[PDB]
Design a protein around this ligand. Structure first.
Ligand SMILES: CC1(C)SCCN[C@H]1C(=O)NCc1cccc(C(=O)N[C@H](C(=O)Nc2ccccc2)C2CCCCC2)c1
Lengths: 100, 101
């Protein structure tokens, strides 16, 4: 497992819209100073069931979050403002309605 | 503005088949790009225009839309460089949800 060190220039140079969803969700920020990005919003489902056409909640269905695996930069060594090792974390990118 | 170069150790220590019971199911599509890390990117593609109800049929009174999110990749700068990158912001479909038109 030889380390593949790489230079990266951090200078980039380039849920409320899905509120009509049957399985709506909110955004919860995740702060971690020893990580890039430091702030990660995570999708928290608003209901246990799914909202039907009428408007009320149907609990025969389940509003589950969509958990995906992405990469984040972990400070190696700790508290290093210029040295990172990328790590594989699990986050919720949204919600979807599923059947039992 | 002023460039912000940092050191990144690239040595680390079916996502659509999981949510097949979704009312707004989707598949994964390959997006290949040599000058980008990671190279392969799987984007979610909704399998139906409408959503699936309790009867298993497709209700077109509802719409299954792709959940688009802004993520980061690593663009090669200079081009074809195997050790130097500048991260860019790209837009991908991380899944599908069922909405009401
Ligand atoms: C795209 C999907 C997950 S969607 C579901 C189906 N296909 C997946 C897929 O194909 N994954 C592979 C892939 C493709 C492209 C990029 C990433 C990636 O891990 N980008 C990182 C990132 O941006 N993380 C982040 C942290 C907190 C807030 C927002 C974003 C950055 C990487 C470079 C260093 C810095 C971090 C991964």
């Amino acid at each position: 497992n030889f380390p593949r060190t790489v230079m990266v220039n951090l200078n980039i140079h380039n849920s409320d819209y899905y509120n009509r969803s049957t399985s709506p969700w909110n955004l919860h920020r995740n702060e971690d100073p020893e990580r890039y990005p430091s702030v990660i919003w995570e999708a928290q489902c608003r209901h246990l069931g799914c909202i039907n056409a009428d408007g009320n909640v149907d609990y025969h269905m389940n509003s589950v979050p969509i958990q995906q695996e992405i990469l984040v930069l972990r400070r190696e060594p700790p508290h290093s403002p210029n040295s990172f090792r990328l790590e594989k974390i699990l986050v919720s990118v949204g919600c979807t309605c599923v059947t039992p």
